[PDB]
Design an enzyme around this catalytic site. Structure first.
Site, PDB file in Angstrom:
ATOM      1  N   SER B 197      -1.317 -15.900   4.255  1.00 14.88           N
ATOM      2  CA  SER B 197      -1.604 -15.327   5.642  1.00 14.88           C
ATOM      3  C   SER B 197      -2.236 -16.504   6.389  1.00 14.88           C
ATOM      4  CB  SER B 197      -2.723 -14.259   5.568  1.00 14.88           C
ATOM      5  OG  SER B 197      -2.615 -13.240   6.513  1.00 14.88           O
ATOM      6  N   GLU B 324       3.663  -5.506   4.834  1.00 16.51           N
ATOM      7  CA  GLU B 324       2.782  -6.444   5.521  1.00 16.51           C
ATOM      8  C   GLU B 324       2.041  -5.830   6.697  1.00 16.51           C
ATOM      9  OE1 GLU B 324       3.429 -10.049   3.177  1.00 16.51           O
ATOM     10  OE2 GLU B 324       1.961  -9.542   4.724  1.00 16.51           O
ATOM     11  N   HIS B 437      -0.257  -6.415   1.836  1.00 22.38           N
ATOM     12  CA  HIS B 437      -0.595  -7.778   2.173  1.00 22.38           C
ATOM     13  C   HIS B 437      -1.907  -8.191   1.507  1.00 22.38           C
ATOM     14  CE1 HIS B 437      -3.405  -9.914   4.904  1.00 22.38           C
ATOM     15  NE2 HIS B 437      -2.485 -10.855   4.786  1.00 22.38           N
TER      16      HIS B 437
END
Ligand SMILES: O/N=C/c1nc(CCCCNc2c3c(nc4ccccc24)CCCC3)ccc1O
Ligand SMILES: O/N=C/c1nc(CCCCNc2c3c(nc4ccccc24)CCCC3)ccc1O
Ligand SMILES: *[C@@H]1O[C@H](CO)[C@@H](O)[C@H](O)[C@H]1NC(C)=O
Ligand SMILES: *[C@@H]1O[C@H](CO)[C@@H](O)[C@H](O)[C@H]1NC(C)=O
Ligand SMILES: *[C@@H]1O[C@H](CO)[C@@H](O)[C@H](O)[C@H]1NC(C)=O
Ligand SMILES: *[C@@H]1O[C@H](CO)[C@@H](O)[C@H](O)[C@H]1NC(C)=O
Ligand SMILES: *[C@@H]1O[C@H](CO)[C@@H](O)[C@H](O)[C@H]1NC(C)=O
Ligand SMILES: *[C@@H]1O[C@H](CO)[C@@H](O)[C@H](O)[C@H]1NC(C)=O
Ligand SMILES: [Cl-]
Ligand SMILES: [Cl-]
Ligand SMILES: [Cl-]
Ligand SMILES: [Cl-]
Ligand SMILES: [Cl-]
Ligand SMILES: [Cl-]
Ligand SMILES: [Cl-]
Ligand SMILES: [Cl-]
Ligand SMILES: [Cl-]
Ligand SMILES: [Cl-]
Lengths: 532, 532
Positions: B197, B324, B437
């Site tokens: 990320s 996500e 995520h």
């Protein structure tokens, strides 16, 4: 004698015909109008003057003057649709099959043939009403109507060629059934009009047109609806094509009167030979002379009539076949052939898309491509073929009909929707064409009941089912029998939108026929084009 | 002694730590910059002045000053991401785990943490490098960098707060590894940067920025890429948010010099308390102070750099998790809660869509809705939930990354793509959030190898696989072993676009990761908005 009948215009003598180891009565070629010939070409029909003596109604009449398909000479798949009688402008006749013995008062069904308003015949073998009349105890009428320029040359504001006269032909046949069918043992109060494709669009048109609504009880539409993109033109476009016809034929173009006098001077085949030349640039999915939104037959635009409830409110039974685009592509799209599997390159796919929506900007073309591409692999020839087939069928038949179904159901008194997805075992057209448009008709008329025809026994059962659905709907307004025991065909409602599959497997119910695609064609793509 | 090391800035004394019934060396909290405090707040980092004596590198350092998540107090799912050390502006330190005995020259991996550029810590338990260093014989560095306003307040044209200084923090740590890692037995020629990320976007940024490319060999991106909509702002927007920060804090706004002097006068928690207030109207998927496209760190626009090949050309290994969008929706979208199944009405769905693309016109909103609705039933709460989750993840993470993968592969020297879709057996976050995520990180660091952690044995195998993929890629530029016997992870090519699934089932290969959706977000929806 049950083969003689007095009607409001004269005596008619029919013939006794055999059917499935029995016999019924048939009245073939009854005139319902004056022959629309000479200076009557293009004119609204006039009723048949009464005749003395007995009308010999023992043999099929002439077919109307039309284009004849010669793409596949001697091929049965194509020639079973061509005129099987002499062509003539004297063609306004109807046929009637009456159960034996003559009923006192039974349901009537009136067949309206398709053929894109440029062709069609009431005398085809797949339209032989004797199996339906016999099996289901109905009176089966099939009418005829002028096609091509002869029935749809639209010079608005004139009275010599106003347009829509082919629909007025159908209306007069319906008026004739209303006035005379009682003498044949038919119940004029319970007349169901049904037709396929162009005839399906015609049925829908009769539902919309105020001057037609009182001539029938209820209606069946197969693979056609009045809002189909190929089924009507504006008054301005009809006038443009009529002038363009005269230009092709060395006609004085100064006045409507002189344009029409020249067109009347021509021989029928001269009009036909040039009729595809009046089409616009994008013409592969279009037909030259079609009904015209004229403010008379159709008071306003079809869409506003559908929105405001301006149409006869009755029961309707309608549906589509799985693969409605196949004939369009075979006959008009480069890369498709009768004798190949017609696998399509990624390149050929884009062209089909372009052809399909020729007025879409670049953004519209991308939208259709995104909607119908298999992105997991672009260069699958079979996928590309099937995708283009789906585009054409969705845009020209299925999604127009779905739009018609949804608008109509808001106001009508009962909708029944079907999805016909059984490919006939004896189909001579190639396999890639699938469950082809037009190839449910043989089931609706009970052709599979005839052994020589080489249908399977499960295809005989299906035909029996479909004939019974159709005729029960015609008699009562519901395809299902009163408290019988088979699977019931549910009503199509606005909130649940149920329909059935028609095939040789046991019936199952589904919901929301191709709703994702129809939302794309009916709602999304219009908004996108109105905004660029 | 193997716990003492001379470096170009001083001696450091590490500590011996245990790991999986053995031991390795750890050097925790080595300074790589001068503490960015006082009138150095906002400034580019300066290198750490050399020190005499031995630096006690036996304990974790301070975390940087950041927002702390208190939505779920005491809940482990959220607090495992919060700072577990004292926060301080004196936070520019790195940590190193060195195999025992000290290697002579082995592959180095440098971890860059995520947290949306507003949060993150190198000292979290899921980032403990001892299992990876031990199991795979690598030197594991984790760096730190200023987050929030402290690292990304962008007042372009000034030299007191130019922006991007948090990325300059990362670059200096990389410069330090280049210059000193040899003394710890790491091979400075074979440094792999990897991060998740925001750290994934950071890795990508280092690949693009000319001033960073020579400080590492190759790169791994997890659930993040530099072109992500949340990962950068324009120079004009960064300046707008910096002024808006001063307005929230009663700062003279006449000059950059006076704006910055006031911001420097404040206590760290005063900046944090107000930092979400500078966001625009559509802020639910945005973070306040992020990297700025400044013409210096990034010579031109990210997209033009990607198009023209203006980036370091090496091997890359990257991928996403199946779900996500889940944290975005849970924390910011009304109707989602940690403790419900979060079923979404048709009404709530439309709002999510609106929120997702707040600048789309009516046509764009319809396009997203058409793309992600289940039209077979609109009012399925689970479908609506999953659809919104897919929208958010596709638009903010997956499809940006796919765009980055495609552009990069045209020029780079090897791409390896993965799709991680195994939900940890011990995940405390609700089931509806899916393969969340951030929850592959524990597998990358080998947490499942620790029994007390309550992972299944198949989760231990997966972690072992992933660690080996990662470290083999770091050593050689290919995740696969030379002529071993397991399933090979194929190269991602422009024409075939293969990727693998990472989960507990045997590995299978697929192609074209979410290509239909990515074609919608990356190609179609842009064209539609540029045309209305
Ligand atoms: O679809 N085939 C299309 C097609 N055919 C032919 C051969 C028959 C002659 C015209 N005949 C027809 C035409 C068109 N449409 C037809 C539809 C059914 C039957 C004949 C047609 C549209 C464009 C003009 C000509 C040529 C070109 C074509 O593009
Ligand atoms: O996404 N949650 C969103 C969210 N939270 C809160 C509670 C924490 C306080 C602000 N805190 C955050 C904010 C925002 N985004 C955040 C992301 C992660 C952590 C805190 C955030 C964007 C809008 C402004 C505030 C309130 C409103 C929200 O809209
Ligand atoms: C009707 O016409 C057909 C064909 O011309 C003829 O064979 C038949 O005998 C005629 N019937 C009568 C009763 O005149
Ligand atoms: C059809 O009309 C009758 C009234 O004539 C009404 O009672 C019935 O419910 C209607 N059915 C539908 C399906 O609209
Ligand atoms: C039925 O099948 C036979 C082959 O056994 C064939 O010769 C005949 O022409 C077929 N009939 C029709 C109507 O297709
Ligand atoms: C390093 O610091 C820790 C914590 O303050 C302390 O316990 C430890 O003894 C120190 N080590 C040395 C060698 O000074
Ligand atoms: C990587 O670069 C080398 C040359 O240094 C080349 O031979 C090799 O084929 C390249 N591999 C890929 C996947 O581009
Ligand atoms: C592992 O499971 C036990 C239950 O048997 C639980 O008490 C313990 O806290 C769990 N450990 C972790 C780290 O979640
Ligand atoms: Cl009479
Ligand atoms: Cl027979
Ligand atoms: Cl009305
Ligand atoms: Cl178009
Ligand atoms: Cl609709
Ligand atoms: Cl030294
Ligand atoms: Cl341990
Ligand atoms: Cl370059
Ligand atoms: Cl937007
Ligand atoms: Cl792309």
């Amino acid at each position: 004698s049950e083969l003689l009948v007095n009607t409001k215009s004269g005596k008619v003598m029919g013939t006794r015909v055999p059917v499935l180891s029995s016999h019924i009565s048939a009245f073939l070629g009854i005139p319902f109008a004056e022959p629309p010939v000479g200076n009557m070409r293009f004119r609204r029909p006039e009723p048949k003057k009464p005749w003395s003596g007995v009308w010999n109604a023992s043999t099929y009449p002439n077919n109307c003057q039309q284009y004849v398909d010669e793409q596949f000479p001697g091929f049965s798949g194509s020639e079973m649709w061509n005129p099987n009688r002499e062509m003539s402008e004297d063609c306004l006749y109807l046929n009637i099959w009456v159960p034996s013995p003559r009923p006192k008062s039974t349901t009537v069904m009136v067949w309206i043939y398709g053929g894109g308003f440029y062709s069609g015949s009431s005398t085809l073998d797949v339209y032989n009403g004797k199996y339906l009349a016999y099996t289901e105890e109905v009176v089966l009428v099939s009418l005829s109507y002028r096609v091509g320029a002869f029935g749809f040359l639209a010079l608005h504001g004139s009275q010599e060629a106003p347009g829509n006269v082919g629909l007025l032909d159908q209306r007069m046949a319906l008026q004739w059934v209303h006035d005379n069918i009682q003498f044949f043992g038919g119940d004029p109060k319970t007349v169901t009009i049904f037709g396929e494709s162009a005839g399906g669009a015609s049925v829908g048109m009769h539902i919309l047109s105020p001057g037609s609504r009182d001539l029938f009880r209820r209606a069946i539409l197969q693979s056609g609806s009045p809002n189909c993109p190929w089924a009507s033109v504006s008054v301005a476009e009809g006038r443009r094509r009529a002038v363009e016809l005269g230009r092709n034929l060395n006609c004085n173009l100064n006045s409507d009167e002189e344009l029409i006098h020249c067109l009347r001077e021509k021989k029928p085949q001269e009009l036909i030979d040039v009729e595809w030349n009046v089409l616009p640039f994008d013409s592969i999915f279009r037909f030259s002379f079609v009904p015209v939104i004229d403010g008379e037959f159709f008071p306003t635009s079809l869409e506003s009539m559908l929105n405001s409830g301006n149409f006869k409110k009755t029961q309707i039974l309608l549906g589509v076949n799985k693969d409605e685009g196949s004939f369009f592509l075979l006959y008009g799209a480069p890369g498709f052939s009768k004798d190949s599997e017609s696998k399509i390159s990624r390149e050929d796919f884009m062209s089909g898309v372009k052809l399909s929506v020729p007025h879409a900007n670049d953004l519209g073309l991308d939208a259709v491509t995104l909607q119908y591409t298999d992105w997991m692999d672009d260069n699958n020839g079979i996928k590309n073929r099937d995708g283009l087939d789906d585009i054409v069928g969705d845009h020209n038949v299925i999604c127009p009909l779905m739009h018609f179904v949804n608008k109509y159901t808001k106001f009508g008194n009962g909708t029944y929707l079907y999805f016909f997805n059984h490919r006939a075992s004896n189909l001579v057209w190639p396999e890639w064409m699938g469950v082809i448009h037009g190839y449910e008709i043989e089931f609706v008329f009970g052709l599979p009941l005839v052994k020589e025809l080489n249908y399977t026994a499960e295809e005989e059962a299906l035909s029996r089912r479909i004939m019974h659905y159709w005729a029960t709907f015609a008699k009562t307004g519901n395809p299902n029998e009163p408290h019988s025991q088979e699977s019931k065909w549910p009503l199509f409602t606005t909130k649940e939108q149920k329909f059935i599959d028609l095939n040789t497997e046991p019936m199952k119910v589904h919901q929301r026929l191709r709703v994702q695609m129809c939302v794309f064609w009916n709602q999304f793509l219009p908004k996108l084009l109105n905004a660029t």
